[PDB]
Amino acid sequence: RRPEEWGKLIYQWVSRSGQNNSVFTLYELTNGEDTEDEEFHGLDEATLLRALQALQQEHKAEIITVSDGRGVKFF
Amino acid sequence: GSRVTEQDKAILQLKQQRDKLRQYQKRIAQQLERE
């Protein structure tokens, strides 16, 4: 695997099915209920952020890093 | 420029407070059966 590959998998999941939300905490992507059966559940924050950074570079995501509400929006 | 709204960030502040409580809830669930 690679962070960009993890990126490909996460973005696939946001689009295919779980399409109500555009805004996700980093925690719920890896430890939430809706993603429990996905290949990226349990993925560490560090690698998740690098996955999301590759997505952000392709304009598919914008990361929110403020401590009062960390997470990511997908486009 | 940013494509994230004040509304988007407001969801996230609440979803974060939810998340941290969920982490403690899971820890309790685990302990309830531990004994």
mmCIF file of C-alpha atoms in Angstrom:
data_model
loop_
_atom_site.group_PDB
_atom_site.id
_atom_site.type_symbol
_atom_site.label_atom_id
_atom_site.label_comp_id
_atom_site.label_asym_id
_atom_site.label_seq_id
_atom_site.Cartn_x
_atom_site.Cartn_y
_atom_site.Cartn_z
ATOM 1 C CA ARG A 1 0.000 0.000 0.000
ATOM 2 C CA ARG A 2 0.779 3.751 -0.156
ATOM 3 C CA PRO A 3 -0.849 6.954 1.273
ATOM 4 C CA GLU A 4 -2.128 7.843 -2.255
ATOM 5 C CA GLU A 5 -3.640 4.321 -2.484
ATOM 6 C CA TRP A 6 -5.249 4.755 0.942
ATOM 7 C CA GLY A 7 -6.460 8.077 -0.534
ATOM 8 C CA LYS A 8 -8.002 6.263 -3.508
ATOM 9 C CA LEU A 9 -9.791 3.851 -1.123
ATOM 10 C CA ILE A 10 -11.152 6.489 1.248
ATOM 11 C CA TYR A 11 -12.428 8.695 -1.560
ATOM 12 C CA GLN A 12 -14.083 5.699 -3.199
ATOM 13 C CA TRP A 13 -15.990 5.090 0.081
ATOM 14 C CA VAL A 14 -17.120 8.708 0.552
ATOM 15 C CA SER A 15 -18.555 8.646 -2.992
ATOM 16 C CA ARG A 16 -19.895 5.067 -3.202
ATOM 17 C CA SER A 17 -22.788 4.932 -0.687
ATOM 18 C CA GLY A 18 -21.877 7.044 2.387
ATOM 19 C CA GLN A 19 -22.736 10.193 0.421
ATOM 20 C CA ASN A 20 -24.883 12.177 2.859
ATOM 21 C CA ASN A 21 -21.855 13.696 4.623
ATOM 22 C CA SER A 22 -19.234 15.904 3.004
ATOM 23 C CA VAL A 23 -17.615 16.731 6.390
ATOM 24 C CA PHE A 24 -15.941 14.022 8.544
ATOM 25 C CA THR A 25 -13.779 14.042 11.680
ATOM 26 C CA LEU A 26 -10.500 12.194 11.208
ATOM 27 C CA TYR A 27 -11.532 9.856 14.065
ATOM 28 C CA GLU A 28 -14.832 8.753 12.505
ATOM 29 C CA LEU A 29 -13.162 7.810 9.214
ATOM 30 C CA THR A 30 -11.001 5.238 11.010
ATOM 31 C CA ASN A 31 -12.955 4.391 14.209
ATOM 32 C CA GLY A 32 -16.571 5.292 13.338
ATOM 33 C CA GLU A 33 -19.560 2.989 12.761
ATOM 34 C CA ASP A 34 -20.261 3.730 9.090
ATOM 35 C CA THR A 35 -16.738 2.783 8.005
ATOM 36 C CA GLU A 36 -16.285 -0.242 10.331
ATOM 37 C CA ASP A 37 -16.076 -2.818 7.534
ATOM 38 C CA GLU A 38 -13.827 -0.739 5.229
ATOM 39 C CA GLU A 39 -10.158 -1.435 4.442
ATOM 40 C CA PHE A 40 -9.155 1.861 6.125
ATOM 41 C CA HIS A 41 -10.807 1.264 9.503
ATOM 42 C CA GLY A 42 -8.131 1.157 12.222
ATOM 43 C CA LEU A 43 -5.748 3.085 9.914
ATOM 44 C CA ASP A 44 -3.424 5.210 12.086
ATOM 45 C CA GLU A 45 -3.928 9.037 12.111
ATOM 46 C CA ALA A 46 -0.441 9.646 10.723
ATOM 47 C CA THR A 47 -0.999 7.584 7.572
ATOM 48 C CA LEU A 48 -4.603 8.832 7.260
ATOM 49 C CA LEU A 49 -3.343 12.423 7.156
ATOM 50 C CA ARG A 50 -0.864 11.580 4.379
ATOM 51 C CA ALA A 51 -3.712 9.864 2.471
ATOM 52 C CA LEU A 52 -5.821 13.004 2.916
ATOM 53 C CA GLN A 53 -2.911 15.275 1.883
ATOM 54 C CA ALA A 54 -2.598 13.428 -1.449
ATOM 55 C CA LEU A 55 -6.374 13.916 -1.880
ATOM 56 C CA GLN A 56 -6.106 17.616 -0.966
ATOM 57 C CA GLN A 57 -3.358 18.017 -3.645
ATOM 58 C CA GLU A 58 -5.860 16.707 -6.245
ATOM 59 C CA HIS A 59 -8.560 19.117 -4.880
ATOM 60 C CA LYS A 60 -10.624 16.151 -3.668
ATOM 61 C CA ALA A 61 -10.375 17.164 -0.011
ATOM 62 C CA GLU A 62 -9.656 20.054 2.296
ATOM 63 C CA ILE A 63 -8.257 19.221 5.727
ATOM 64 C CA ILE A 64 -9.433 21.070 8.862
ATOM 65 C CA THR A 65 -6.703 21.178 11.474
ATOM 66 C CA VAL A 66 -8.135 23.450 14.163
ATOM 67 C CA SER A 67 -8.107 21.679 17.523
ATOM 68 C CA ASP A 68 -11.760 22.575 18.322
ATOM 69 C CA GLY A 69 -12.968 20.532 15.374
ATOM 70 C CA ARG A 70 -10.448 18.566 13.346
ATOM 71 C CA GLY A 71 -11.408 16.747 10.210
ATOM 72 C CA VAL A 72 -11.779 16.801 6.480
ATOM 73 C CA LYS A 73 -14.228 17.914 3.780
ATOM 74 C CA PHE A 74 -14.447 15.929 0.557
ATOM 75 C CA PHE A 75 -15.294 17.452 -2.815
ATOM 76 C CA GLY B 1 -9.258 30.151 -1.098
ATOM 77 C CA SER B 2 -10.957 27.779 1.386
ATOM 78 C CA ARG B 3 -14.018 25.815 0.440
ATOM 79 C CA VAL B 4 -14.874 25.080 4.106
ATOM 80 C CA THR B 5 -17.790 27.003 5.673
ATOM 81 C CA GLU B 6 -18.361 28.250 9.240
ATOM 82 C CA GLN B 7 -21.269 25.766 9.194
ATOM 83 C CA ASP B 8 -18.847 22.955 8.166
ATOM 84 C CA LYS B 9 -16.576 23.857 11.089
ATOM 85 C CA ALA B 10 -19.553 24.060 13.485
ATOM 86 C CA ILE B 11 -20.597 20.484 12.505
ATOM 87 C CA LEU B 12 -17.057 19.365 13.142
ATOM 88 C CA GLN B 13 -16.745 20.981 16.618
ATOM 89 C CA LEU B 14 -19.840 19.038 17.640
ATOM 90 C CA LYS B 15 -18.798 15.800 15.878
ATOM 91 C CA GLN B 16 -15.437 16.046 17.715
ATOM 92 C CA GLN B 17 -17.064 16.357 21.176
ATOM 93 C CA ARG B 18 -19.174 13.358 20.193
ATOM 94 C CA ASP B 19 -16.101 11.404 19.144
ATOM 95 C CA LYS B 20 -14.133 11.898 22.386
ATOM 96 C CA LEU B 21 -17.170 10.790 24.418
ATOM 97 C CA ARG B 22 -17.548 7.769 22.127
ATOM 98 C CA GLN B 23 -13.877 6.780 22.917
ATOM 99 C CA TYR B 24 -14.647 6.882 26.668
ATOM 100 C CA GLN B 25 -17.957 4.977 26.099
ATOM 101 C CA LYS B 26 -16.080 2.147 24.356
ATOM 102 C CA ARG B 27 -13.596 2.010 27.230
ATOM 103 C CA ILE B 28 -16.554 1.669 29.698
ATOM 104 C CA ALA B 29 -18.257 -1.052 27.606
ATOM 105 C CA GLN B 30 -14.975 -2.993 27.677
ATOM 106 C CA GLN B 31 -14.744 -2.660 31.477
ATOM 107 C CA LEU B 32 -18.350 -3.609 32.222
ATOM 108 C CA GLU B 33 -17.677 -7.082 30.864
ATOM 109 C CA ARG B 34 -14.095 -7.171 32.228
ATOM 110 C CA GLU B 35 -15.648 -8.014 35.591
#
